[PDB]
Design a protein around this ligand. Structure first.
Ligand code: GLO
Lengths: 466, 464
C-alpha cells in the first residue's frame, strides 16, 4: 500500500500540517532527518493514518505517483539539502511543495532548476501558527499555474475558510511570488505586534493600568473595529499566571527574538525604493530589545523625564485606541504599496484584493480589517496607496488628531513610540506636495555636482553656488 | 619609472592623479578609452603626467612593488580592469580600488588576488570631485604591509585636520575601508535629513525668509554645530536665481541617490543593529521620489496647519538643540554599527582613528568629530557614544528641546522622521524594560517559540 501525500519535516508546523492533511481523510507518509522526532509524532498520535519512514528512499517509494511531497523544513541550507536528497528517487512529473519560510529569491532559483528537471514545483507560504497549521492556515502558493492546479484540491482541503465560505488559498503568481507574499505577511505581523506593544507602553506608562485593566481594555478593543487575532490573544496573555501566582507577562524577559522575514521585508523595501518605515522600525525595535545588557547599563546613566499627567482616563484610552488603529492603517498602506512595487519588479501581476482576502482567516494577522482592504482593492484594483481609499482616508481624517496627541504625550513622557511616530511622519510626508528634498538636491549639487531639476523648465542643471 | 599609476580618467581618477602630481610625483595614467587620456594631457600642460595607451606599457612604467590606483566606476568595470592587469603584474604588486565599492566585493577581490600573489586595497575616497583634487579623506583596507608601502603617497594627498594629522589611516583588513566609506555615506544621508527637518521647522513654523534661514544657519555654524554641511546650507539659502529670486525654491524636491544609499541600512539589518535614523533618512529620500503620488495624495488627504510657534528666539534655539542631539543619536547608532561590523568581519577597528580621518576632507567633516575622537581615546571600546560623559551631558541638557520640537511638529503636520527616530531611540536605549515581553508572550502563544524569564534560567513554553 502507498500513501497519498508525504510531509518532510516534523517540527511543530510540519507535524501539524501532516495532521491537518490526515484529518481531511488522506493517508500521509512522514519523514524527518532527526528520526527520534518522527517516532515521537507516531507515539503521540495513535489512531491517525500517518505512516513513518526512516530513510528518504523508503519515504519516496511509499508515495502514489505522481508524488506529492510537502517540505516544512528549516529555511536555507536545510531545505536545499532536503530537496537534493529527494531528487535521485523521484520520477519526472513528481510534485514538490516547499511550504517553509523560504527567501523568495531562493524560490525563484529553485523553481527554475526543478522545472527544467521536469518536476512540478510550488513555493508556498503557510501562515497560522501551531493552531492554524493544524486546523486551517492561510496558504499562498507561487509557481507555474499548471503546478498549482495539480495541488489546489488538497491545498483547498487544508486551508482556513473565511466566514463567507471562501478558502484562504489562491494562486498568487509565478515563481517566488507566494514566498514574497508570505514575507510581507510576516513583516506586517511584526508591525502589528510592535503597534500593540506601543499601546501597552502607553496604557501602562500613562495610566498605570494593572494587568487586569490592560486585559479589560484589550477585550473592549477586540469587540470593535480593532478585532483581530493578535488583539484577542493579547487580552488573554494579560491575565495568565504561572504555577506560583506571577503574571507571566511580568516575568518574561523583554528580548524579542526573530527568524528573519522581518529583516527580509525591510531589506526588500530598501532594494525597491519603498518607504516602509513602520515595519522597519518594528524590526529595529526587536533589535534594540535584544541589546538587554546595554539597555540595563544605559538606564543607570542616561537621564529622562517622568510620565506626564494623562488627563481623563477614558479619553486617554480612546486616543490610544484611535492611534493604534490609524497606525495599523499606515503600516498596511506601506506594505500593500511594497507588494505593488515587488509585483512590478518581479513581473507577477499580483491581485492585491485576493491577497487581502486570504488573510481574513488562518493567518496571524487575521482580522475584519482585512475585509476593508479587500473591498478597497475590489473597487480600485490598481489603487496606489490604501490611504486614498474613502474608508481609510476618512478614518485618517477622524483619528489623526488622537494619533498626534498620543505621540506628543509619549515624547513628553519619555515613552518610546517608534511606530506611532513613524506613522505620523509618513502620513505628513506622503500628503506633502513639497518636501525639503529641494535642499538635499541643492546640497548634492554643491558638494558633488550631481545636478538637479527645476519646477519651471526642462532639463538638468548645475550651479556655482558661491 | 613612476612610483604610482592611475587607471580610469573619468573625473575622480584624473583629479586624484593631479593631486598626487601636485605633491611632487610623476604619474602614469591610462584609460580604457584613448580619448579621455588624451583630453587630460592637453588640459594640464607642464604637469608630470605620463600617458600610456596600452595596459602592458602602463604596468611596465611602474616601479615595483607596483602601486596602481584604480578609479574606474565601481561595478563590473572593476573586475575587467583587474582582469586586464593580472597578466602583467608581479607577485607583490598592489591594486588600490578607490571606487565607492560594496565591501563584500572588495572582500572577494582581496581573497582572489591574494591567492594569485597580488595585494588589493579597497579604499574609500570622500570629498567630492573637488576633494579628490585638493585633499580627500582616504579610508583604505587590505594588506597592512601594502598599505604601509603606499602610505607616504597617501599621507601627502589627504586632507589635514586641525592638529596637523593627515585624514588617512590603515582601517583594517580586506573590505574594512570600503565598509567605513559606506558608513560615512549613511551618516551623510542622516545629517542631510536632520538639516532638512530643521529647515522644515523654521520655514513652516516661524515662516523665516531665506535670508533669515541663512542668518540662522550662519549663527549655528559658529558654535558646536560647526560643519561643512551647515556652512554650505547657509550659502544655498543666500543664492539668487539670475532674476532676483532664490534658486533653492525652484529645485524639484525629488532626492536621488543612485542605488547605493541603502547599503548602510541593509548592513544594519543583517547585523542586528537598530540604525533607525540613517534608515529613516533613506526612506525620506524614497518618499520624495514618489512625487506623483505625493501630489495626488495632497489633493485628497487632510491635515492640521502649523501651530503658534511662540517666542521666535526660543523656537530657533530649541530647533538648534534638537538638530545637535539628533546628530549625536545618528552617530551613536552608526558607531555602534561599526563595532558590530568589526566583530562580524574580524577587523579590530579603531573607532577613534576613524573619527579622526572624518575631521576634514570628507562631506561630514565638522568640529563634532573631535568630540567622538575624544570619547574613543578615553574609552576605545565604549559600547555606545551616548555613554560618554560629553554626550550624556548634551542629552541631559537638550532632550527637552528635542521633545518640544517633535511635539510641535506632530501637532503642526510637519514631518520629522529623523527627529522622531532620535527621541524613540534615546527613550528605548535607556529603557531597562521594553514591551518586548508582550511580543515574546505572543510569539510563544501562537508559534510555541519559547521565552526566557527574568527570575529563572532556561527556555520556557506556556500552554496558553
Ligand atoms: O515573530 C517572529 C517569529 O520568530 C517568526 O518565526 C514568525 O513570526 C513565525 O511566523 C512564527 O510562527
Amino acid at each position: 500500500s502507498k500513501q497519498q501525500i508525504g510531509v518532510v519535516g516534523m517540527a511543530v508546523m510540519g507535524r501539524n500540517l501532516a495532521l491537518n492533511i490526515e484529518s481531511r481523510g488522506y493517508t500521509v507518509s512522514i519523514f524527518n532527518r532527526s528520526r527520534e522526532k518522527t517516532e515521537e509524532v507516531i507515539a503521540e498520535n495513535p489512531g491517525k493514518k500517518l505512516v513513518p519512514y526512516y530513510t528518504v528512499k523508503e519515504f519516496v517509494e511509499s508515495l502514489e505517483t505522481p508524488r506529492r511531497i510537502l517540505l516544512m523544513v528549516k529555511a536555507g541550507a536545510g531545505t536545499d539539502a532536503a530537496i537534493d536528497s529527494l531528487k535521485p528517487y523521484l520520477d519526472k512529473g513528481d510534485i514538490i511543495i516547499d511550504g517553509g519560510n523560504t527567501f523568495f529569491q531562493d524560490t525563484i532559483r529553485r523553481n527554475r532548476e526543478l522545472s527544467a528537471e521536469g518536476f512540478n514545483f510550488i513555493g508556498t507560504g503557510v501562515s497560522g501558527g501551531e493552531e492554524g497549521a493544524l486546523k486551517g492556515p492561510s496558504i499562498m502558493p507561487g509557481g507555474q499555474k499548471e503546478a498549482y492546479e495539480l495541488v489546489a484540491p488538497i491545498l483547498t482541503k487544508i486551508a482556513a475558510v473565511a466566514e463567507d465560505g471562501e478558502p484562504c488559498v489562491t494562486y498568487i503568481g509565478a515563481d517566488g511570488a507566494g514566498h514574497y507574499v508570505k514575507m510581507v505577511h510576516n513583516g506586517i505581523e511584526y508591525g502589528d505586534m510592535q503597534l500593540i506593544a506601543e499601546a501597552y507602553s502607553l496604557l501602562k506608562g500613562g495610566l498605570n493600568l494593572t494587568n487586569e485593566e490592560l486585559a479589560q481594555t484589550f477585550t473592549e478593543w477586540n469587540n470593535g473595529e480593532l478585532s483581530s487575532y493578535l488583539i484577542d490573544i493579547t487580552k488573554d496573555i494579560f491575565t495568565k499566571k504561572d504555577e506560583d501566582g506571577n503574571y507571566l507577562v511580568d516575568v518574561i524577559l523583554d528580548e524579542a527574538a526573530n527568524k528573519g522575514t522581518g529583516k527580509w521585508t525591510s531589506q526588500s523595501a530598501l532594494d525597491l525604493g519603498e518607504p516602509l518605515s513602520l515595519i522597519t522600525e518594528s524590526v529595529f525595535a526587536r533589535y534594540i530589545s535584544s541589546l538587554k545588557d546595554q539597555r540595563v547599563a544605559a538606564s543607570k546613566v542616561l537621564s529622562g523625564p517622568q510620565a506626564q499627567p494623562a488627563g481623563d482616563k477614558a479619553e486617554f484610552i480612546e486616543k490610544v485606541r484611535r492611534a493604534l488603529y490609524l497606525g495599523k492603517i499606515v503600516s498596511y498602506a506601506q506594505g500593500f504599496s511594497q507588494l505593488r512595487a515587488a509585483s512590478e519588479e518581479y513581473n507577477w501581476d499580483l491581485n492585491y484584493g485576493e491577497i487581502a482576502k486570504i488573510f481574513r482567516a488562518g493567518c496571524i494577522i487575521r482580522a475584519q480589517f482585512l475585509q476593508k482592504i479587500t473591498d478597497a482593492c475590489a473597487e480600485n484594483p490598481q489603487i496606489a496607496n490604501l490611504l486614498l481609499a474613502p474608508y481609510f482616508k476618512q478614518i485618517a481624517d477622524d483619528y489623526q488628531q488622537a494619533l498626534r496627541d498620543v505621540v506628543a504625550y509619549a515624547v513628553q513622557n519619555g515613552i518610546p513610540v517608534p511606530t506611532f511616530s513613524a506613522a505620523v511622519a509618513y502620513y505628513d510626508s506622503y500628503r506633502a506636495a513639497v518636501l525639503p528634498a529641494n535642499l538635499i538636491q541643492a546640497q548634492r549639487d554643491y558638494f558633488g555636482a550631481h545636478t538637479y531639476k527645476r519646477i519651471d523648465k526642462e532639463g538638468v542643471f548645475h550651479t556655482e553656488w558661491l
